Every structure is written in structure tokens, then in C-alpha cells.
Design a protein around this ligand. Structure first.
Ligand SMILES: [Mg+2]
Ligand SMILES: [Mg+2]
Ligand SMILES: [Mg+2]
Ligand SMILES: [Mg+2]
Ligand SMILES: [Mg+2]
Ligand SMILES: [Mg+2]
Ligand SMILES: [Mg+2]
Ligand SMILES: [Mg+2]
Ligand SMILES: [Mg+2]
Ligand SMILES: [Mg+2]
Ligand SMILES: [Mg+2]
Ligand SMILES: [Mg+2]
Ligand SMILES: [Mg+2]
Ligand SMILES: [Mg+2]
Ligand SMILES: [Mg+2]
Ligand SMILES: [Mg+2]
Ligand SMILES: [Mg+2]
Ligand SMILES: [Mg+2]
Ligand SMILES: [Mg+2]
Ligand SMILES: [Mg+2]
Ligand SMILES: [Mg+2]
Ligand SMILES: [Mg+2]
Ligand SMILES: [Mg+2]
Ligand SMILES: [Mg+2]
Ligand SMILES: [Mg+2]
Ligand SMILES: [Mg+2]
Ligand SMILES: [Mg+2]
Ligand SMILES: [Mg+2]
Ligand SMILES: [Mg+2]
Ligand SMILES: [Mg+2]
Ligand SMILES: [Mg+2]
Ligand SMILES: [Mg+2]
Ligand SMILES: [Mg+2]
Ligand SMILES: [Mg+2]
Ligand SMILES: [Mg+2]
Ligand SMILES: [Mg+2]
Ligand SMILES: [Mg+2]
Ligand SMILES: [Mg+2]
Ligand SMILES: [Mg+2]
Ligand SMILES: [Mg+2]
Ligand SMILES: [Mg+2]
Ligand SMILES: [Mg+2]
Ligand SMILES: [Mg+2]
Ligand SMILES: [Mg+2]
Ligand SMILES: [Mg+2]
Ligand SMILES: [Mg+2]
Ligand SMILES: [Mg+2]
Ligand SMILES: [Mg+2]
Ligand SMILES: [Mg+2]
Ligand SMILES: [Mg+2]
Lengths: 205, 57, 134, 113, 109
RNA sequence: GAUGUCGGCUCGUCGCAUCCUGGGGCUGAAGAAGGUCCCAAGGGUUGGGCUGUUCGCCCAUUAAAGCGGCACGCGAGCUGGGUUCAGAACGUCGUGAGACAGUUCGGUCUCUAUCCGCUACGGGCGCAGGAGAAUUGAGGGGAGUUGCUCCUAGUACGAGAGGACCGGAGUGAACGGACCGCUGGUCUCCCUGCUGUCGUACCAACGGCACAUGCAGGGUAGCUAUGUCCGGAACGGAUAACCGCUGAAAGCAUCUAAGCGGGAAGCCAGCCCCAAGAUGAGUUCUCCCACUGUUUAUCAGGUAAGACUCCCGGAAGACCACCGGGUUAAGAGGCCAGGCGUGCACGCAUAGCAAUGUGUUCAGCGGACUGGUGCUCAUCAGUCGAGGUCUUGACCA
RNA sequence: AUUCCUUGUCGGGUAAGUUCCGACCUGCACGAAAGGCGUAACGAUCUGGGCGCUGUCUCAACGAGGGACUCGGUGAAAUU
RNA sequence: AAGGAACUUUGCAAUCUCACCCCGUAACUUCGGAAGAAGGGGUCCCCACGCUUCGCGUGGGGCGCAGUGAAUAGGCCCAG
């Protein structure tokens, strides 16, 4: 249910009581409501809010129409959340309480194309026992004539990164509302200045 | 070792492969002065103009 | 971080000068004796971890002799130790205290400092023979 | 990957002898013709060296002299040009794209003050 | 990837300063005494590490210095957060005449 | 007219005749620890010593250290120790040349993937107008391991010694994902020290060469694991062995012959990821609108909404793609300020016979960090992009 | 360098030693110029063990340079 | 980083060692050797003093993490 948008600002050291907590600083700036999707409107229950501000001079006629219909003023980013309401618009105030466990989604830093070691954790090869250009390669890719083919899904070199990743049960250390900042324990995927969606827990714990 | 093709590739195949070697013709603009043609954000190679006049003659 | 093959010096009068690691264990110390393993694998021993070890150099005259095997508990890593404040400890040399299967040390006293983490793991007697609980 | 600078298919020493030669040259004669890239890569090294020479003290001469090994050019950039750039907050240069060469297909370019 | 006008610095530094503390002007080479409080179960003991400062590192809440001591015949180094709750106080004991800023070389002696 | 052969390495995936872990009948099952059998293949199944080993014995652990298939899986993937070429030697056989599935030392393992198959990434067209965005999830993939301690409880049980189910709590190991704040690594010219030599006229100061950094000492951002955060579940629905309810055939009895309930780490759902080329091509919000063309020119042109090309960049990346900025402009560089690294510049003065020391100087220098600023280049411009087929039905003026 | 039975048996070293060393003698199938048993020294010989040191390894990282990739120029091959 | 042969058929490979001076040096032996066995120290700049000069000894002072300051440059041992 609960959810909001913001940007990953960075990681830092703070102390609650006497242990050094590592904290990721998130800015969940205010989100306007824009679209409210219901059953008889769209089939399914959801709300579409928006995050980063955007000047008119950069906004499509159709997009302007969109935003204008709910009179909101325009945003570089829209996203949906299944099963959500209140009224007005949405700041991380109230929406999160300190101590509450949340789920943080982002887009992992992308690594480009990566061999089987870096990508999958292959074992590599003998750096020295006569190994002949087989230091980093993935060994064998199959059996023999049964089944004369290569398994579908077989892990091998490829585009590692730039993927959507959700970390579960991160703990809301601090909330400075009206700076729209959530101090969150641990680590969120994706680089500084990246987009993150924060959510209630998926799990009860 | 020493891989090799199993079978001659048909004229048809070979040519299907080539379906992407189309050169891309320049987008060409006409110099606002001396009037022949130039590339966007390059110096017009006829006169030498890039607003006043940079390369020589 | 200790692992099989990894020699350490000995921090007691037990009589082993030098022991070489052999296995690592994730046993604790609970209720009756020591406990029995935390699983099969576990590759690195650090400070307040029991390991198993074989004696390699010993004192002529003393309880424990060259080749003896025997459990030991790890009291000085060169590796770093991170306490929950951010503080980090780290000692120039790697060292342990040979023990029995109740955990209590085989020696009369511990030599050199020991990591306060031994207190966490309820190694009272070791923690008490110790010149300093850094 | 926020790293910066160009490998320019060269060893560290080469890379340096490049930027120094092409700096010395641009300063020796107000404008030069060069690969568009080598230009891109030259702009901020020379612009900075100018800002150094813009100090006028002997330190800033000796400084410039390490990167620029020809007396006459040093003397030029210290005494003649840096003092001219006096009032401009950097941007001491600019780059023009001439275009494609015959031998090896490469967009050349023009860089100047 | 969300392009928002934002001083990342000042936002960070905001937070980061409620957790920042400055200690005396000691330098690498200087001998120093760190009076730390330790918790032994319910009890709060006071233990006191004193040695050479071989490196200062970081800044903001992250700043840290590194004391090296010899204790009971064994080399030991420790690393403190300027703002560790468990570091009560820091006192310069002697000033060093050091040419570097790191001092690792002292690790043989 | 060649289907490379033992073992290891690397990479997996399957069977179940189940090593562990879960459920259950029986027990020569008090408890605890077992034995055996039935259901169960989700996940897991350690490191070493000896040998070329497969195996097997041993060390030390473990919930367990399962058995097999996949050309005794895997040499256009690596090894090349075993074996089976030429050399040489021993033993043995042979009058000999030679010989042995005896031993021994030595002994070349072939840069380019065409098709299928596989991992990644684009181009095309399709989805009855042209566009910008937001999405349902048909379907598919990943994940699925376990110890220990504590409470219950020194309770049930037990003469006692000992010592629970069940339920609840807590902490790890391995593995996975993300991350770089911390602790560290690296950081090829960011800072300093050092030597031989050649140079910049000489001194002083500097540059080259001594690696493709001459050596050393540090070292930001990035990027990293040994570093840190989080995870495996909870609930539910159908089941297996198995346990029962009601209950005839067969007045008794019977879990079944009609029916009904309880029941596993397995099944389906729930978790995370992809997903309408789901050609069955889906839904929603919005924008443009009803243009021009002697059918000698019945399909095109100029266009709108909107994009692309081109430029400058990017935490995106082989290319392509993706994100941002493109003067109504802070997009990058520069410049300014700050941060941070290095650790006290040059010059001058002083002390000193000198080496050198001190002051000026928390100095000097400057790659990637944080912001500001119109100093530089993002100029000018081109290319492309709708006019919405028909059939039936429903509502409408 | 000779042993089939074979990882012979005991000892040594090792946490653990089918290899190595010593001893034993039951020499499948040693033995005296096809030399026998020793031998200081010599060996890019072979075999085992130790010290030191190390990315050989746990377990891989970061960096560099040369390719691989992209653009312009010239443009092969085995195979079919 | 920590560990240090846990790799493997085998330390294969790669590191450690590295020049010159002084100190010192085993079993064993054909008395030549083994032997550079092993191992330890020194090494740069200034100044004065002495000596046979290109140089070295002695004393005291100086600077750095480090003085064959970069390049050339033995890893050793035990036992078959
Ligand atoms: Mg990237
Ligand atoms: Mg490896
Ligand atoms: Mg088939
Ligand atoms: Mg013994
Ligand atoms: Mg090239
Ligand atoms: Mg550091
Ligand atoms: Mg054939
Ligand atoms: Mg063939
Ligand atoms: Mg055969
Ligand atoms: Mg299995
Ligand atoms: Mg067979
Ligand atoms: Mg096979
Ligand atoms: Mg094959
Ligand atoms: Mg062989
Ligand atoms: Mg004969
Ligand atoms: Mg192909
Ligand atoms: Mg589905
Ligand atoms: Mg399909
Ligand atoms: Mg699956
Ligand atoms: Mg109790
Ligand atoms: Mg009792
Ligand atoms: Mg950082
Ligand atoms: Mg770092
Ligand atoms: Mg002259
Ligand atoms: Mg000079
Ligand atoms: Mg030269
Ligand atoms: Mg030369
Ligand atoms: Mg060089
Ligand atoms: Mg060279
Ligand atoms: Mg360095
Ligand atoms: Mg991990
Ligand atoms: Mg840990
Ligand atoms: Mg049920
Ligand atoms: Mg495109
Ligand atoms: Mg590009
Ligand atoms: Mg600055
Ligand atoms: Mg410079
Ligand atoms: Mg900037
Ligand atoms: Mg034996
Ligand atoms: Mg023998
Ligand atoms: Mg003979
Ligand atoms: Mg080409
Ligand atoms: Mg080390
Ligand atoms: Mg060994
Ligand atoms: Mg070698
Ligand atoms: Mg002699
Ligand atoms: Mg010597
Ligand atoms: Mg000194
Ligand atoms: Mg010295
Ligand atoms: Mg050498």
C-alpha cells in the first residue's frame, strides 16, 4: 500500500544511542496526485503520482493536457502504486513513521557486459598450471550428443547491471519532514541522484 | 580446433545479411552566405563561414 | 581471519610456542560444555572463535607437546575488528590461547592483550587471566 | 564510472608529451588544426596553463616552464597573453569543426583563442 | 536519473553535522591519550588508550584517527570516530616532528 | 576417406533405489537417543594427508558429508599426471634382431564459428489514424538449505541417571542480491621524497630516460570483498504416506462403496524479476484534426500534434540502444568558492665552515568531489511525420 | 631404475604419508669387468623433506599497456 | 587486506635472494675441497684528521620510509 518517490542523495555515518548506523539519505520530495485509477475507470485499484519538477518549455502538448486535467503542474516522472489513496498529495510525513520497515526499489548501477566470474560467480581457471588461454572462461556449456544442445537460461557473459532491484525490510532510522528526507538504514540500489521508490513492507516479519 | 563453415551460404542468405549496410546520406544544409552546402555545426567549406568568417578562402 | 594452514603464536604458559590451524568450527560455549558446530563449513576464524590446531613448536618442559592437536581460542587477529560504534582494533600478530573442552584455558595465565570480544563470547576465565582487555 | 581524461591509445608519457607539444603549438600560433578529439582533450589543459601564467609572479613562470619547454613560448604566454586575458573568467579558447579528411576518414578541427 | 536541482553536499552535510564533533588540533606524529568509556554489561568502565597518531582520515561525521600503541609486548592500533559516543575525550601529550601524514613506516620498530 | 581414449579442472542438469533436512505406520517405542518401513527429489551434501587416480584408508569437522544417468556428461573448454610413437635403463624372455598392457626417466595437445543451440543488444514490420506518457498480467524465470542457544522446563517421563514433544524467542554458517557510509585493496602521473645521466647558457629551479609509472611513500572519485545492509519466510488452497467422522453392502464391525474432515521442506497461490510479437498484439489518461492534388497524375505532397538528424555530456554503454542539456540556456569544459589528497612550494631572510636547519608557510601544488558563475562550445538548420477500410448491432439528435 | 602378491612388516617424518628414508629377508624375476658394493666432488638429471617468499591457492580486485569493439583505407583462409 | 603451498601430477609458474667490503661458516672428504656453505653487519651527504694517489681509514655532524636510493644483480638447506 504505502509508497512514495524520491532521489538517492548518498550514504553516511550516524549514531543512534551508541551504535554507528550506516544510513542512506533519501529525499522523498512531495508528490502530487495527478491520476486516480479505480475499478470502473481502469479495471484495477491504483494511484499515479509524480516526482521531479519540469518547466513548461519542455512539456508535450499531450503531457500538459494530462497534468492540467488534475491541475497539478508538471513533473519529469510519473509512477503508479497499487492500492493507495489519502487526499490532496503525498509527502513522506505520516506516510512513514520512524522505526517502520520499508521496501526500497531502484535501478542498480549498470556494469555493461561482464564475464561469468563478475556476473554469475564462476570459478574461473588455473592461473598457472599450463592453462592455455583458459584463465577466465566459463569451461563447458553442455553435455555431449545427448542432448546436443545448450540449456535455455544457461548463465554466461552478458549485460550485468542497470536492473530493477528491491531490497526488503530496511528500517526507517530518521525522518526530517519539511526537508522531505528519510534516513534509512543499510543500502539502496542504484547510484546517487538516482530514482527510488519507497514502500511499506511486502512482508509481515 | 579450426572452425569452418559447413555449407556454402546461399546468395539469398548472404544478401539477407547485407540488409543493413545502407549508408546514411548526410543531412546537408545550405550555407547562409557563399551558398553551396555544409554539415550542421561545421564550417561551410565553400567560403569559410561559421557566422563571420573562420577558415581561409 | 584464520584458516587451515594459518600458524599463530600462543598466548599462555600451556607450553605450546606455535600452533598451526587445522579446522575452524563455529562452536560456541553454552550451558554444559562447549557447544558442537555451527554447521559444516565456515572458512575464517576471528577472535572469540574456537579453532582446532596442531602444535608445531613447544617449550621443552611443559603441559603441551610438539604435535599435540588440541582446540585453541583466538585472542589476537591481525585482521580488523569492528565494534558497534565504529571503533576498530587490530594487533600486529596473530595469537591464541589453547583450551580444554569446557573452554577453560589449559595454561596458568594469558600473555599479551586480548580482544574484549572474548567477554561477549562468555570466555570468562580467559578474559580474567588477561593482562589487558582492549 | 565517473573517470576523466582520454587514453588516446597512448602510454602515460606519450599522453603527456602530446598535451605539452600541442599546448606549446597552440600558444605559439593562436590557432591550430588537429584531430577533433585531440582538440577536445587539449582545451582544458591549455586553458588551465593560461590561468597559471595569469599569476605573473616568478612561481607561475617556473610552473608554466615545466609544462612548456620552449623559452620563447613561455615568455610569450607570461608577458603577452595571460595579461591580455586579464579580465576573462577563463574560457580562453574555442573549437571549430572543419570536417572529414581523405587518408583516414577523420573529422578534423580547429582550436583557437 | 531524476534530475532535481539539489545541493547534494549541503543536504548530506545537514544530517552529517548532528553527528560531527571536533577534537583538539592533534596531528600525525603527535602522541595522544584517548579516554574512552566501555560498557561491561550494566557497568560503565573507563579505559584509556594512549599512543602515536599515525593517520587522520575522512571528515564530517566520518572523520577518524588512528592511534598505535605497544601493549604488553604486542603491537596494537585502534581507529576512532571523532564522534564515537564511546570516546569521551582526547588529550595531546606530546608534539611530533613528522615529515609525512601517514606514518605506516613506524609499524617496524 | 578418424565417432580423441583414464583422471583432474570448469560448467551444469536429470533419475530416486533418500546421506541431511520435512511428514508418517510399526517397534524387542518409558524419556532422551535409535531400528526399520511408507510418503517425499524443495534446497543442501566441508576442508585436508597419501596416490595420476576413479575408488579406498587416514586427519579434522558436519544436519549430512547420498547412489547413479547425461558418448563410464563436458580436450573446436583447459590440463596432460595414467595409457599406447620414436630415446634410454632395470628385471625377465629370446642364440639373435627384438619382446612384456612389468617397472623406470624423457617426450609438439591445431590464433578466425558458417547453421542449429545459448547469453546479451539493436534494426524492420506488425498490432485499422498520427503521436506522448501511465499500465492489467496471459504466461515465464529466480528463489526454496541448516546448525547452535534460550524460554517453555529441570516440567511430561523416569526408581534413578537423565531428560522431551508442542509452542515461542534469539544468534550464526554457507549461499544470493544490492551497496561503498565504515574497515581495507587499488587508484599508470593527484602530492612528495630519491638515484645515475642528458638537457633547459651556468647557479638555483625544472624536464626527459632509466616499464609498456625509473624507484619509493602516501592517495580523492570511481571500482572492489575479506567490508556493510537485506533475504530464504508468514498466512492460505489442493494433496502424498498416514490419521480419522458418518456408514451400508455383510442386523456386528469397517475412514468408502455415495459423501465429509485433518494431513509434508513437496503441488498451486502468496515473495522478487521479465512479460501484450499474449499476431488472442489488451486497458487508461492526454494531444493533433477532418488539408492539398484538370481519375491525360486513385495514390502521393505540404503539414499539425510529435519525433528524428546534428552538437555538448552522462552515475547508460562494444556498436546500437537508454538519460540529460542544447541560448526562453547551468549540459559539459573553464573560471570562482568550498571539500579532499599531499604535507610546508619558489623566492628572500637568518643560523651554520659545510651538509643542512629555521622563518616567511595549517604553505605550495591539483584527476575524477560539492556548488555558484553566461568566460567557451552547444550556431544555423535540415529530415520525417495524421486525414483515419468494411460488416453487422446498440444508443443519439 | 630389479618386488608379482603390494599401500609387504616395523620405525621415522606428518594432524593425517600408496611417495621418500632406515631396518627386516618370504630376492615372483640382484650378484661380481653384459662388472659387485662404496665413494668426496661435479648435475638446466631424477626423487622426498625443510627454511624463506609468494595471487599457486581460499578468491579474487583495482590498475596499465597491446588486441578484441567503432569509423575511413587495402582485404585473405581452411571449408562448401 | 588476512592467510601462506591450504594450489597441483610437481611450488609448474611467479616472488623472495641479488653487486662490493668486513665478520663469520657444518657434516664429509681423494685434504684440492665442499664454500658465495649457512649467518650477521656495512654502504648516502657534509666537515676535520691521518694515510700511498682515481681513493680509503678514523672521528663527529646532516637528511629521508628507504643510501649497490634508478638499472644490470645467487633464494638457501637436509636426504636419497
Ligand atoms: Mg555504468
Ligand atoms: Mg582464481
Ligand atoms: Mg534434440
Ligand atoms: Mg613427534
Ligand atoms: Mg589503434
Ligand atoms: Mg585509508
Ligand atoms: Mg567423413
Ligand atoms: Mg571429423
Ligand atoms: Mg582405446
Ligand atoms: Mg539434487
Ligand atoms: Mg561403461
Ligand atoms: Mg567420458
Ligand atoms: Mg568436445
Ligand atoms: Mg603423461
Ligand atoms: Mg639371456
Ligand atoms: Mg554466426
Ligand atoms: Mg502468471
Ligand atoms: Mg509463448
Ligand atoms: Mg524454477
Ligand atoms: Mg529455568
Ligand atoms: Mg534432576
Ligand atoms: Mg567515498
Ligand atoms: Mg576508499
Ligand atoms: Mg647564449
Ligand atoms: Mg643544478
Ligand atoms: Mg632524451
Ligand atoms: Mg635512450
Ligand atoms: Mg617510461
Ligand atoms: Mg622506454
Ligand atoms: Mg605508487
Ligand atoms: Mg557476501
Ligand atoms: Mg562477518
Ligand atoms: Mg487442508
Ligand atoms: Mg531510434
Ligand atoms: Mg558515444
Ligand atoms: Mg581549491
Ligand atoms: Mg600538472
Ligand atoms: Mg563543476
Ligand atoms: Mg608407516
Ligand atoms: Mg628402503
Ligand atoms: Mg656400470
Ligand atoms: Mg574497417
Ligand atoms: Mg600482507
Ligand atoms: Mg607438503
Ligand atoms: Mg621455478
Ligand atoms: Mg678446510
Ligand atoms: Mg654470503
Ligand atoms: Mg629519520
Ligand atoms: Mg642506515
Ligand atoms: Mg632476477
Amino acid at each position: 500500500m504505502k509508497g512514495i518517490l524520491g532521489t538517492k542523495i548518498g550514504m553516511t555515518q550516524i549514531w543512534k544511542n551508541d551504535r554507528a548506523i550506516p544510513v542512506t539519505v533519501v529525499l522523498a520530495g512531495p508528490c502530487p496526485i495527478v491520476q486516480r485509477k479505480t475499478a470502473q475507470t481502469d479495471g484495477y485499484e491504483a494511484v499515479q503520482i509524480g516526482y521531479a519538477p519540469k518547466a513548461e518549455r519542455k512539456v508535450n502538448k499531450p503531457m500538459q493536457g494530462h497534468f492540467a486535467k488534475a491541475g497539478v503542474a508538471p513533473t519529469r516522472i510519473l509512477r503508479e502504486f497499487r492500492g493507495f489513496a489519502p487526499d490532496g498529495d503525498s509527502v513522506n510525513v505520516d506516510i512513514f513513521a520512524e522505526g517502520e520497515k520499508i521496501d526500497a526499489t531502484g535501478t542498480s548501477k549498470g556494469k555493461g557486459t561482464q564475464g561469468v566470474m563478475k556476473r554469475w560467480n564462476f570459478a574461473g581457471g588455473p592461473a598457472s598450471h599450463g592453462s592455455k588461454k583458459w584463465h577466465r572462461r566459463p569451461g563447458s556449456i553442455g553435455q555431449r550428443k545427448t542432448p546436443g544442445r545448450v540449456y535455455k537460461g544457461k548463465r554466461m557473459a552478458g549485460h550485468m547491471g542497470m536492473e530493477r532491484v528491491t531490497v526488503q525490510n530496511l528500517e526507517v532510522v530518521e525522518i526530517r519532514a519539511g526537508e522531505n528526507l528519510i534516513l534509512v538504514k543499510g543500502a539502496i540500489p542504484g547510484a546517487n541522484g538516482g530514482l527510488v521508490v519507497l514502500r511499506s513492507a511486502a512482508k509481515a516479519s | 580446433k579450426h572452425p569452418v563453415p559447413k555449407k556454402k551460404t546461399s546468395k539469398s542468405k548472404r544478401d539477407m545479411r547485407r540488409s543493413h549496410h545502407a549508408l546514411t546520406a548526410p543531412n546537408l544544409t545550405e550555407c547562409p552566405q557563399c551558398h553551396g552546402k555544409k554539415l550542421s555545426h561545421h564550417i561551410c567549406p565553400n567560403c569559410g563561414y561559421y557566422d563571420g568568417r573562420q577558415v581561409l578562402a | 581471519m584464520i584458516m587451515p594452514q594459518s600458524r599463530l603464536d600462543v598466548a599462555d604458559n600451556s607450553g605450546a610456542r606455535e600452533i598451526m590451524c587445522i579446522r575452524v568450527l563455529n562452536s560456541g560455549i553454552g550451558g554444559k560444555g562447549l557447544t558442537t558446530g555451527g554447521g559444516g563449513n565456515k572458512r575464517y576464524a576471528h577472535v572469540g572463535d574456537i579453532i582446532v590446531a596442531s602444535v608445531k613448536d613447544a617449550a621443552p618442559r611443559g603441559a603441551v607437546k610438539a604435535g599435540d592437536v588440541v582446540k585453541a581460542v583466538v585472542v589476537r587477529t591481525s585482521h580488523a575488528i569492528k565494534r558497534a560504534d565504529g571503533s576498530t582494533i587490530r594487533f600486529d600478530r596473530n595469537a591464541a590461547v589453547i583450551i580444554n573442552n569446557q573452554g577453560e584455558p589449559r595454561g596458568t595465565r594469558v600473555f599479551g592483550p586480548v580482544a574484549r570480544e572474548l567477554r561477549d563470547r562468555r570466555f570468562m576465565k580467559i578474559v580474567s587471566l588477561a593482562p589487558e582487555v582492549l | 564510472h565517473g573517470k576523466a581524461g582520454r587514453k588516446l591509445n597512448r602510454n602515460s608519457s606519450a599522453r603527456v608529451a602530446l598535451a605539452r607539444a600541442q599546448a606549446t603549438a597552440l600558444l605559439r600560433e593562436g590557432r591550430i588544426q588537429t584531430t577533433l578529439t585531440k582538440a577536445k582533450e587539449l582545451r582544458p589543459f591549455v586553458e588551465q596553463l593560461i590561468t597559471t601564467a595569469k599569476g605573473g609572479d616568478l612561481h607561475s613562470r617556473r610552473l608554466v616552464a615545466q609544462d612548456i619547454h620552449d623559452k620563447d613560448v613561455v615568455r610569450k604566454v607570461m608577458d603577452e597573453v595571460a595579461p591580455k586575458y586579464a579580465e576573462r573568467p577563463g574560457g580562453y579558447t574555442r573549437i571549430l569543426r572543419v570536417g572529414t579528411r581523405r587518408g583516414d576518414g577523420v573529422t578534423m578541427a580547429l582550436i583557437e583563442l | 536519473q531524476t534530475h532535481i536541482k539539489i545541493n547534494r553536499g549541503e543536504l548530506l552535510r545537514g544530517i552529517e553535522q548532528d553527528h560531527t564533533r571536533q577534537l583538539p588540533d592533534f596531528r600525525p606524529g603527535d602522541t595522544v591519550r584517548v579516554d574512552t568509556k566501555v560498557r561491561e554489561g550494566n557497568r560503565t568502565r573507563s579505559q584509556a588508550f594512549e599512543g602515536v597518531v599515525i593517520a587522520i582520515n575522512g571528515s564530517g561525521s566520518r572523520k577518524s584517527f588512528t592511534v598505535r600503541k605497544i601493549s604488553f609486548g604486542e603491537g596494537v592500533e585502534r581507529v576512532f570516530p571523532f564522534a564515537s559516543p564511546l570516546v569521551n575525550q582526547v588529550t595531546i601529550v606530546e608534539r611530533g616532528k613528522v615529515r609525512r601524514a601517514k606514518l605506516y613506516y613506524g609499524k617496524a620498530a
